[PDB]
Amino acid sequence: DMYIERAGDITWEKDAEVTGNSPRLDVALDESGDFSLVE
Amino acid sequence: GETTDGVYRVMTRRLLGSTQVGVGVMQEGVFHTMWHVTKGAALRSGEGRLDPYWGDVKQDLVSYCGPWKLDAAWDGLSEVQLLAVPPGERAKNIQTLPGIFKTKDGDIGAVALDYPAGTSGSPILDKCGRVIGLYGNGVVIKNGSYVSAITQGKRE
Ligand SMILES: CC(=O)NCc1ncc[nH]1
């Protein structure tokens, strides 16, 4: 039995921690909603 | 139950203690999350019940109480923020420049941030605070790192 609990407002934060790269990938999406890499 | 707009954890007491299985967005009286978080089951909010209204396994999305309301889109150029809600931890904003998933049916923004599975359904936002999609359906690349699509639904 699943239940929800509020965690916060949805807002943009000024000076938030900035990280992560920006990969450009060729991908495929199957009927089950799974993404896979195309090589 | 609680119907105030914002981000919410999705919990279960089926396993040991209370376990966070995902996250979602309440907007315009509709609860939005990824299908793999709830598998389309009903949800509880205090003494109230939220029933599924729309869902799609291939998109990996589900809405409760009404139709999918989120329609903002990544501009393809700017940094966005993941409003990560990790299990047992406070909501935190992480800013990043999305990459791209190139598919036979078009390009989708993608964020290269790795959080616990229970963070699935956390919203990705633009500079105006609009939700441009949900985090948690993606792929593991050569480096072994996780890259999530920015998954957005259609507002009918
Ligand atoms: C293959 C896949 O989408 N993994 C699930 C996930 N891991 C962390 C967040 N979401």
UniProtKB/Swiss-Prot annotation, chain A:
Membrane topology (UniProt): Multi-pass membrane protein
Annotated signal sequence range: none
Residues in the Cytoplasmic compartment per record: 1-39
Region described as Disordered: spans on this chain: 8-30
Region (Interacts with and activates NS3 protease): 4-39
The record's note on its domains: The central disordered region transitions to ordered by binding to NS3.
Subunit structure: Forms a heterodimer with serine protease NS3. May form homooligomers. Interacts with human SPCS1. Interacts with non-structural protein 2A.
Function summary: Required cofactor for the serine protease function of NS3.
Protein name: Serine protease subunit NS2B
Organism: Zika virus
UniProtKB/Swiss-Prot annotation, chain B:
Subunit structure as annotated in this protein's UniProt entry: Forms a heterodimer with NS2B. Interacts with NS4B. Interacts with unphosphorylated RNA-directed RNA polymerase NS5; this interaction stimulates RNA-directed RNA polymerase NS5 guanylyltransferase activity. Interacts with non-structural protein 2A. Interacts with host SHFL; this interaction promotes NS3 degradation via a lysosome-dependent pathway. Interacts with host CEP63; this interaction disorganizes the centrosome and inhibits host innate immune response.
Location of the protein in the cell: Host cytoplasm; Host endoplasmic reticulum membrane
Stated role: Displays three enzymatic activities: serine protease, NTPase and RNA helicase. NS3 serine protease, in association with NS2B, performs its autocleavage and cleaves the polyprotein at dibasic sites in the cytoplasm: C-prM, NS2A-NS2B, NS2B-NS3, NS3-NS4A, NS4A-2K and NS4B-NS5. NS3 RNA helicase binds RNA and unwinds dsRNA in the 3' to 5' direction. Leads to translation arrest when expressed ex vivo. Disrupts host centrosome organization in a CEP63-dependent manner to degrade host TBK1 and inhibits innate immune response. Inhibits the integrated stress response (ISR) in the infected cell.
Native organism: Zika virus (ZIKV)
Peptidase S7 domain ranges (all copies): 1-156
Protein name listed in UniProt: Serine protease NS3
Recorded coiled-coil stretches: none
Residues of the full protein shown: 1514 to 1669 of 3419
Membrane topology classification: Peripheral membrane protein
Protein origin, superkingdom: Viruses
PTM annotation: Acetylated by host KAT5. Acetylation modulates NS3 RNA-binding and unwinding activities and plays an important positive role for viral replication.
Positions annotated as active site in the UniProt record: 36 (charge relay system), 60 (charge relay system), 120 (charge relay system)
